[PDB]
């Protein structure tokens, strides 16, 4: 196309400098078929206002594209209405200053696949093709505030897939620079497989003769276990995982000495991740991308961070932690150790029902910072040495104190929180919890009885209303799933995985469609135990139920 205005060019590390940090604007035109398809309402450009007062620097922009096709082979034609949405977010973000990344996202596995037995990859390449040449057309007049990226995390197995990535790399840099306009100065995001740092590292190669201005990005979901509430774990910051933290993003740095890095999507989510383990990821992430000179873009569905309908922040801590890596952050202390048979986390006073109130000491990491103040959640700010005092590294809260805020008999559930204020950095939370064990409306049920679907099963959610992990035996001492679990200490072993074999929502623990067809093919009848937080054993916290075939 013929541009209009000025394209005020900018070379790939000083673009990458500038977005630091990123918001992605997840489940929104990634969302398939449309963009409120997903759990996100249509996308209003308020939500960039929170996203630019929070301190976010830049916002990442998934897109799938799948579903706006117009034509098949041989011109794909996208919606012209979908291109024009997607020229007008880019405006709403643009206009208030944030830096843009635009993809092209879920079509990665929808129908871009290279790793996938039956694909046509000479049309799988036409389509990328003419679709980079569309997108590239319609953007082509954008400022150098907008970069474009190749394709979200393809799905990529073997060094013969790792070329077929590098040739994505190839063919989307030729489609934007035939399209023209500012085309062929604008910063662009290259990919490896799965946009995996080892992937990356292993296979990705340098498309020759590249005339961009480009980055590179990968994505970061690791440890697995604790990022995605695998086996039981619900704790990280041990020695052993800062080191594979550090070692991992090292390794993608020692081998992409010199090039502009962009992590563009992580997260340990609020919603599943225990708060002081993931106050302490984010802080040791961001720690590393500040060590290895890469620039962080948290990932955010919509349920994870920001309420784009309130425009509060689920999770205010990680997003202090994101938006300011030149701050040293006081952190709660928590169990690191998956040998010890307790787990304790500084994120929480925990008082059980029926117990007597006690003095609740909370071990801290200050790293150098002072306590400044604390303040509840009710507005009301603690008297320091009377309502707490600090003791080396301990919070210590007096009994008479915590009683101001519940008893012996106090009803179960999250009672308010404290805000602690330091000499800098972070403010965390510690979240007052009266809790007692749930109970469960079912005890057991006959998997015929409850096919059709997933097992949802009601309960009386009794302080946390979180489900920590479930464990899964088979009556006769096997594990339900994933066997290698039993080297994963008392709270892991046989506990198998959020979302893949269980779930919860305000009122039911969910074992999936697929865990009740374990328990079928395993012709017995096996015991689930659904375990909450705190984690004070493998036992107490805990309810029972069993899954007759
Ligand atoms: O918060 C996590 C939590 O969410 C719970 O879902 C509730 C909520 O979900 C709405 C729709 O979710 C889609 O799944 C998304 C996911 O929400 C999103 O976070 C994820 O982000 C990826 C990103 O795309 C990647 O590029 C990269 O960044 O990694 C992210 C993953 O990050 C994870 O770890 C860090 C956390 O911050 C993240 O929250 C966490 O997820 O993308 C997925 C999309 O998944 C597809 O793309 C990635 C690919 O690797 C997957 O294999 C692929 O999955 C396929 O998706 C298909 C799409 O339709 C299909 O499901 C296939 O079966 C699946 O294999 C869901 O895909 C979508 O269905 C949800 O929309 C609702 O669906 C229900 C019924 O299905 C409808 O009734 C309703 O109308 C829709 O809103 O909002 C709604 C609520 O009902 C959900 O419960 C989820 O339950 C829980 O397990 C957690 O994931
Ligand atoms: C310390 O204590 C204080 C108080 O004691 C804590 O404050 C509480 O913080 C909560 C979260 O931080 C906050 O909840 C939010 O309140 C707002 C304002 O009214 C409300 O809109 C929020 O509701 C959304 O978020 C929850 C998840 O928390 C969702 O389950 C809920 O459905 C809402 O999400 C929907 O709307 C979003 C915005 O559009 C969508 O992105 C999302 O996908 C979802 O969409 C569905 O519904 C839509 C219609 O709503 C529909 O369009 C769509 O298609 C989907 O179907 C949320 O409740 C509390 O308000 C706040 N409490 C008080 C008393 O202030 C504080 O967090 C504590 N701090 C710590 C660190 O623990
Ligand atoms: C760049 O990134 C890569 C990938 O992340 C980094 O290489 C990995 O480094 C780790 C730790 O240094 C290695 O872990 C150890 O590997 C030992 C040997 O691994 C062999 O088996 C692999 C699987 O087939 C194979 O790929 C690998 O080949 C490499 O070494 C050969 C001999 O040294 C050499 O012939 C090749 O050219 C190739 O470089 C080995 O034969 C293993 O025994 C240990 O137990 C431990 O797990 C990974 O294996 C490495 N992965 C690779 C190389 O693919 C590399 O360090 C990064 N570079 C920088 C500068 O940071
Ligand atoms: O699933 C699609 C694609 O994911 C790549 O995995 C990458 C990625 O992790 C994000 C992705 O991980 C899957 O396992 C989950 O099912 C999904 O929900 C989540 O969004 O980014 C960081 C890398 O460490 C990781 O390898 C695969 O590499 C790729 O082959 C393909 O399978
Ligand atoms: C329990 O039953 C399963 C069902 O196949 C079997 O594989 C397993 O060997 C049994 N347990 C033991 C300890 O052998
Ligand atoms: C659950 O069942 C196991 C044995 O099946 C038992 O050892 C444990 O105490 C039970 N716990 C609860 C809370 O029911
Ligand atoms: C874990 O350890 C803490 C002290 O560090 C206790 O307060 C808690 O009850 C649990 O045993």
Redesign the pocket.
């Given at each position: 196309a013929n541009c209009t205005g000025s394209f005020d060019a900018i070379s790939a590390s000083d673009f990458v400098a500038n977005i630091n940090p990123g918001w992605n604007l997840?489940?929104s035109l990634?969302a398939?078929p449309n963009e409120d398809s997903?759990?996100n309402p249509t996308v209003q450009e308020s939500t960039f206002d929170y996203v630019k007062a929070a301190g976010f620097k830049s916002v990442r922009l998934?897109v799938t594209w799948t579903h706006h096709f117009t034509s098949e082979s041989p011109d794909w034609t996208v919606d012209p209405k979908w291109l024009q949405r997607v020229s007008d977010v880019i405006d709403m973000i643009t206009s208030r200053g944030l830096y843009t990344i635009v993809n092209v996202?879920?079509d990665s596995?929808e129908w871009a696949d290279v790793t996938k037995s039956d694909a046509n990859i000479t049309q799988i390449e036409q389509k990328f093709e003419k679709l980079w040449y569309q997108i590239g057309t319609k953007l082509a007049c954008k400022s150098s505030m907008v970069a474009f990226e190749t394709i979200?995390?393809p799905p990529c197995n073997t060094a013969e897939d790792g070329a077929k990535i590098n040739k994505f790399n190839e063919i989307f840099l030729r489609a934007i620079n035939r399209a023209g306009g500012f085309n062929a100065k604008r910063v662009v995001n290259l990919v490896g497989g799965g946009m995996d740092s080892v992937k990356t590292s292993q296979w990705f190669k340098t498309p020759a003769n590249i005339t961009n201005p480009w980055a590179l990005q990968f994505?970061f979901?690791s440890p697995y276990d604790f990022?995605?509430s695998a086996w039981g774990k619900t704790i990280w910051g041990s020695d052993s995982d800062k080191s594979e933290l550090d070692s991992t993003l090292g390794l993608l740095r020692g081998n992409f000495t010199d090039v502009p890095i962009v992590l563009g999507?992580f997260?340990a989510?609020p919603?599943n991740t225990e708060p002081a383990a993931r106050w302490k990821y984010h802080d040791y992430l961001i720690r590393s991308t500040k060590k290895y000179n890469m620039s962080p873009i948290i990932?955010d569905?919509g349920?994870?961070h920001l309420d784009r309908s309130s425009g509060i922040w689920r999770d205010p801590v990680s997003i202090e932690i994101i938006t300011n890596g030149n701050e040293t952050n006081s952190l709660p202390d928590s169990t690191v150790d998956t040998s010890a048979p307790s787990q304790s986390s500084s994120a929480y006073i925990y008082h059980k029902v029926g117990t007597e109130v006690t003095d609740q000491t909370l071990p801290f990491i200050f790293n150098d910072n002072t306590l400044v103040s604390i303040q509840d959640s009710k507005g009301t700010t603690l008297k320091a040495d009377t309502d707490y005092t600090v003791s080396g590294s301990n919070i210590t809260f007096p009994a008479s104190f915590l009683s101001t805020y519940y008893s012996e008999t106090s009803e179960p559930g999250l009672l308010p929180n404290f805000t602690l204020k330091f000499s800098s950095g972070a403010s965390p939370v510690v979240q007052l919890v009266q809790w007692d064990t749930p109970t469960l409306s079912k005890t057991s049920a006959a998997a015929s009885s409850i096919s059709g679907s997933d097992l949802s099963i009601p309960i009386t959610w009794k302080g946390l209303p979180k489900l920590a992990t479930v464990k899964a035996l088979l009556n006769n001492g096997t594990y339900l799933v994933d066997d290698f679990t039993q080297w994963f200490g008392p709270f892991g072993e046989a506990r198998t995985t959020?979302?893949n074999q269980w779930?919860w929502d305000d009122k039911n623990v969910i074992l999936t469609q697929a865990t009740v067809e374990a328990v079928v093919a395993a012709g017995q009848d096996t015991v689930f135990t659904f375990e909450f937080f705190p984690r004070v054993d493998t036992t107490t916290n805990t309810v029972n139920f069993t899954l007759t075939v």
């Open positions: 997840g489940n990634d398939t997903w759990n998934p996202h879920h596995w979200n995390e994505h979901y990022i995605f999507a997260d989510s919603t990932w569905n349920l994870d959020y979302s779930n």
